[PDB]
Amino acid sequence: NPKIALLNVELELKAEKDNAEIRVHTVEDYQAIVDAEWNILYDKLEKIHHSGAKVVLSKLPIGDVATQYFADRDMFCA
Amino acid sequence: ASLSLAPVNIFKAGADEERAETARLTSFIGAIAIGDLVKSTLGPKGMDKILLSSGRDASLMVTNDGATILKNIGVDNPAAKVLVDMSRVQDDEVGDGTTSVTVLAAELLREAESLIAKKIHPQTIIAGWREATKAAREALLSSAVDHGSDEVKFRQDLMNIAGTTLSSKLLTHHKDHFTKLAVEAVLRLKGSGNLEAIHIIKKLGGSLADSYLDEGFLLDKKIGVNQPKRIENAKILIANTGMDTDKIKIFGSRVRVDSTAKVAEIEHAEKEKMKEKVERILKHGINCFINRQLIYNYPEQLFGAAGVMAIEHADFAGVERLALVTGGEIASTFDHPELVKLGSCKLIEEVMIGEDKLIHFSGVALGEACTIVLRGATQQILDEAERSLHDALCVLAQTVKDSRTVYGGGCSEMLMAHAVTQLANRTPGKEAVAMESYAKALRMLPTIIADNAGYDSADLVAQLRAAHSEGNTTAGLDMREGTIGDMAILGITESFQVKRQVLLSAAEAAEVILRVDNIIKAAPRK
Amino acid sequence: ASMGTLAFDEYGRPFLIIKDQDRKSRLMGLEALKSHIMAAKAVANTMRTSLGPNGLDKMMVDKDGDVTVTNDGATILSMMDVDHQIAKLMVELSKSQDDEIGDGTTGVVVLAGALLEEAEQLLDRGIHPIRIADGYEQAARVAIEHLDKISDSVLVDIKDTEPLIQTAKTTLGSKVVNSCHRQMAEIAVNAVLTVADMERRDVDFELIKVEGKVGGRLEDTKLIKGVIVDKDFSHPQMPKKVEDAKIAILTCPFEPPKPKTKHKLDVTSVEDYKALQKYEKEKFEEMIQQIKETGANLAICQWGFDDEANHLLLQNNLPAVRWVGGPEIELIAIATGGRIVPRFSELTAEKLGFAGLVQEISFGTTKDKMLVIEQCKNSRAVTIFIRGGNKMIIEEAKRSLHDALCVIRNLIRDNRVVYGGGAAEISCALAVSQEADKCPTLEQYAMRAFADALEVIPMALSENSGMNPIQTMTEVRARQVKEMNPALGIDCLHKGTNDMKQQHVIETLIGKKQQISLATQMVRMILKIDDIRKPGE
Amino acid sequence: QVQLVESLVQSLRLSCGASGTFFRINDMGWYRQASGKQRELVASITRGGTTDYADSVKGRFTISRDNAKNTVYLQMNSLKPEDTAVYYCKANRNWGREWDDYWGQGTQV
Ligand SMILES: Nc1ncnc2c1ncn2[C@@H]1O[C@H](COP(=O)(O)OP(=O)(O)O)[C@@H](O)[C@H]1O
Ligand SMILES: Nc1ncnc2c1ncn2[C@@H]1O[C@H](COP(=O)(O)OP(=O)(O)O)[C@@H](O)[C@H]1O
Ligand SMILES: [Mg+2]
Ligand SMILES: [Mg+2]
In SS3 terms, C88-124 reads as HHHHHHHHHHHHHCCCCCCHHHHHHHHHHHHHHHHHH
Asked about C72 being catalytic, the answer comes back as yes
- Closest listed residue to residue D21, CA positions, set B433, B36, C365, C145: C145
Contacts 24+ apart (CB under 8 A), B255-262: B255/C266, B255/C267, B255/C268, B255/C273, B256/C264, B256/C266, B256/C267, B256/C268, B257/C268, B257/C269, B262/C268, B262/C269
Length reported for chain C? 537
First to last CA, chain C: 12
First to last CA, chain D: 27
- If phi > 0 it is left, if psi is from -120 to 50 it is alpha, else beta; for residue C29 that is left
CA atoms within 13 A of residue C176's CA, in its CB half-sphere: 30
Distance CA B95, CA C366 (A): 10
D64 Cβ partners below 8 Å, 6+ apart?
D45, D72, D73, D74, D75
What is the greatest pairwise CA distance in chain C?
103
CATH of residue C243's domain is 3.50.7.10
Q: Which residues of C271-306 are buried (b: 16+ CB within 10 A; e: fewer)?
A: ebbeebbebbeebbeebbebbbebebbbbbbbeebb
First to last CA, chain A: 18
SS3 A49: helix
Hey, what's the torsion of the CAs at C181, C183, C184, C185, to 10 degrees?
80
Measured CA angle at B352 (ends B349, B355), to 5 deg:
145
CA B224: distance to chain centroid? 35
Residue ranges with strand state E in B152-248: 198-204, 212-213, 217-219, 231-239
Distance CA C406, CA C105 (A): 12
Residue ranges with strand state E in C3-73: 25-28, 57-61, 67-70
DSSP annotation string for B28-70:
HHHHHHHHHHHTTSSSTT---EE----SSS----EE--HHHHH
Contact C280 B519 (CB under 8 A): no
Contact C263 A24 (CB under 8 A): yes
Q: How many CB atoms lie within 10 A of CB D96?
A: 11
Asked about C81 being catalytic, the answer comes back as no
Resolution (A): 3.0
Contact B379, B207 (CB under 8 A): no
Distance CA B375, CA B207 (A): 6
Residues 319-338 of C with CB under 8 A from B: none
SS3 B311: strand
Q: How was this structure determined?
A: cryo-EM
H or E element, residue A44: helix A27-50
B18 Cβ partners below 8 Å, 6+ apart?
B4, B26, B518, B519, B520, B521
H or E element, residue B270: helix B260-282
Distance CA C162, CA C166 (A): 6
Residues 23-62 of C with CB under 8 A from B: 35, 38-39, 41-43, 45-46, 49, 54, 56-62
From residue D57, alpha-carbon distances to B377, C94, C247, C309, D108 in Å are: 105, 61, 73, 90, 18
Distance CA B311, CA B287 (A): 11
Distance CA C282, CA B46 (A): 64
Measured CA angle at C471 (ends C468, C474), to 5 deg:
135
SS3 B244: coil
Contact C264, C286 (CB under 8 A): no
Contact C153 D23 (CB under 8 A): no
Q: How many CB atoms lie within 10 A of CB D82?
A: 10
Distance CA C98, CA C105 (A): 6
Distance CA C283, CA C345 (A): 12
Contact B254 C267 (CB under 8 A): yes
Q: How many CB atoms lie within 10 A of CB D1?
A: 11
Distance CA B68, CA B88 (A): 8
From residue C532, alpha-carbon distances to C8, C305, C428, C537 in Å are: 22, 61, 34, 15
Q: Which residues pair with C27 in a beta bridge?
A: C532
The parent domain of residue C409 ranges over: 227-413
Contact C276, C267 (CB under 8 A): yes
Distance CA B279, CA B277 (A): 5
Minimal CA separation from C447 to chain D, in Å: 21
C208 Cβ partners below 8 Å, 6+ apart?
C191, C192, C195, C381, C382, C383, C384, C405
Contact C388, C214 (CB under 8 A): yes
B265 Cβ partners below 8 Å, 6+ apart?
C269, C270
H or E element, residue B184: helix B175-187
Asked about C105 being catalytic, the answer comes back as yes
CA atoms within 13 A of residue B89's CA, in its CB half-sphere: 30
Burial of A26 (0-12, 13-18, 19+ CB in 10 A): middle
From residue A66, alpha-carbon distances to A56, A70, B226 in Å are: 11, 6, 56
Residues with CB under 6 A from ligand 1: B 41-44, 46, 66, 96-100, 164, 167-168, 408-410, 449, 477, 479, 492, 494
H or E element, residue C270: helix C270-293
Distance CA C215, CA C365 (A): 10
Q: How many CB atoms lie within 10 A of CB A1?
A: 3
- Closest listed residue to residue C333, CA positions, set C175, C460, C227, C484: C227
Distance CA C219, CA B5 (A): 41
Rg (CA), chain D: 13
Give residue D102's identity as a one-letter amino acid code: Y
Contact B247, B420 (CB under 8 A): no
Distance CA C211, CA C221 (A): 10
Distance CA B306, CA B279 (A): 9
Distance CA C50, CA B465 (A): 40
Minimal CA separation from C83 to chain B, in Å: 5
Contact residues, chain C, for B93 at CB < 8 Å: 214-216, 363-365
Burial of B305 (0-12, 13-18, 19+ CB in 10 A): exposed
Per-residue H/E/C for B343-381: EEEEEEEEEEECCEEEEEEEEECCCCCEEEEEEECCHHH
Contact C357, C372 (CB under 8 A): yes
Q: How many CB atoms lie within 10 A of CB C505?
A: 26
Hey, what's the torsion of the CAs at B421, B425, B431, B433, to 10 degrees?
80
Residue of A nearest to C258 (CA): A34
B513 Cβ partners below 8 Å, 6+ apart?
B27, B31, B79, B82, B83, B105, B109, C69
Give residue C310's identity as a one-letter amino acid code: N
Hey, what's the torsion of the CAs at C472, C477, C478, C479, to 10 degrees?
90
Contact C423, C500 (CB under 8 A): yes
DSSP alpha helix (H) spans, C18-161: 30-47, 73-79, 85-100, 107-124, 129-150
Distance CA B68, CA B46 (A): 15
Residue of A nearest to C266 (CA): A25
Pairing relationship of beta strands A76-77 and A4-7 according to DSSP bridges: unpaired
Contact B344, B365 (CB under 8 A): yes
B and D interact (at least 3 Cβ pairs within 8 A): no
Distance C513 CA to ligand 4 centre (A): 14
Distance CA B25, CA B30 (A): 8
Distance CA B52, CA B62 (A): 8
H or E element, residue B159: helix B151-167
Contact C131, D5 (CB under 8 A): no
Contact C228, C389 (CB under 8 A): no
Burial of C159 (0-12, 13-18, 19+ CB in 10 A): exposed
DSSP annotation string for D9-59:
---EEEEEEEEES-S-EEEEEEEEE-TTS--EEEEEEETTS-EEE-SSS-S
- Closest listed residue to residue C345, CA positions, set B189, B441, A35: A35
DSSP annotation string for C360-427:
EE--SSS---EEEEE--SS-S-EEEEEEESSHHHHHHHHHHHHHHHHHHHHHHH--EEEETTTHHHHH
Distance CA B414, CA B409 (A): 9
Residue of C nearest to B2 (CA): C42
Q: Which residues of B401-435 are buried (b: 16+ CB within 10 A; e: fewer)?
A: eebbbbbbbbbbbbbbbbbbbebbeebeebbbbbb
Burial of D45 (0-12, 13-18, 19+ CB in 10 A): buried
Distance CA C109, CA C303 (A): 46
Contact D62, D75 (CB under 8 A): yes
From residue C342, alpha-carbon distances to A27, B157, B235, C379 in Å are: 22, 55, 41, 22
Of D21, D23, D97, the CB nearest to C484: D23
- If phi > 0 it is left, if psi is from -120 to 50 it is alpha, else beta; for residue B119 that is left
Choose which residue among B98, B143, B168 to substitute to test ligand 1 binding: the one with the highest number of ligand atoms within 8 A of its C-beta: B168
SS3 B144: coil
Contact C257 A31 (CB under 8 A): yes
Contact B369, B325 (CB under 8 A): yes
Kindly identify the ligand whose nearest atom is closest to the C-alpha of B498: 1
SS3 B433: helix
Find the chain C residues whose C-beta atoms sit closer than 8 A to any C-beta of D. 149-150, 152-153, 483-486, 501
Contact C105, C94 (CB under 8 A): yes
What domains are defined for chain D? Answer: 2-108 (2.60.40.10)
Distance CA C416, CA C410 (A): 9
SS3 B331: strand
Distance CA C1, CA D70 (A): 60
- Closest listed residue to residue B159, CA positions, set B409, B386, B392: B392
DSSP annotation string for C208-269:
EEEEEEEBS-GGG-EEESSEEES--BSSTTS-SEEEEEEEEEE-S-SS----SSEEEEEE-S
Asked about C365 being catalytic, the answer comes back as no
> Count H helices, E strands: chain C?
17, 17
Hey, what's the torsion of the CAs at C512, C513, C514, C520, to 10 degrees?
110
H or E element, residue B501: helix B496-514
Strand order in the sheet with B493-495: B145-146, B404-407, B493-495
Distance CA B396, CA B388 (A): 12
From residue B69, alpha-carbon distances to A29, B382, B451, C440, C442 in Å are: 63, 17, 20, 72, 68
Distance C170 CA to ligand 2 centre (A): 7
From residue A13, alpha-carbon distances to B158, B505, C443, D18, D100 in Å are: 59, 51, 66, 72, 62
Contact C41, B500 (CB under 8 A): no
- Closest listed residue to residue C275, CA positions, set B463, D50, B505, A30: A30
Contact C153 D21 (CB under 8 A): no
Fold classification of B217-400 is: GroEL (3.50.7)
Distance CA C367, CA C373 (A): 20
Q: After which residues is chain D broken (C to N over 2.5 A)?
A: 7, 10
Contact B160, B492 (CB under 8 A): yes
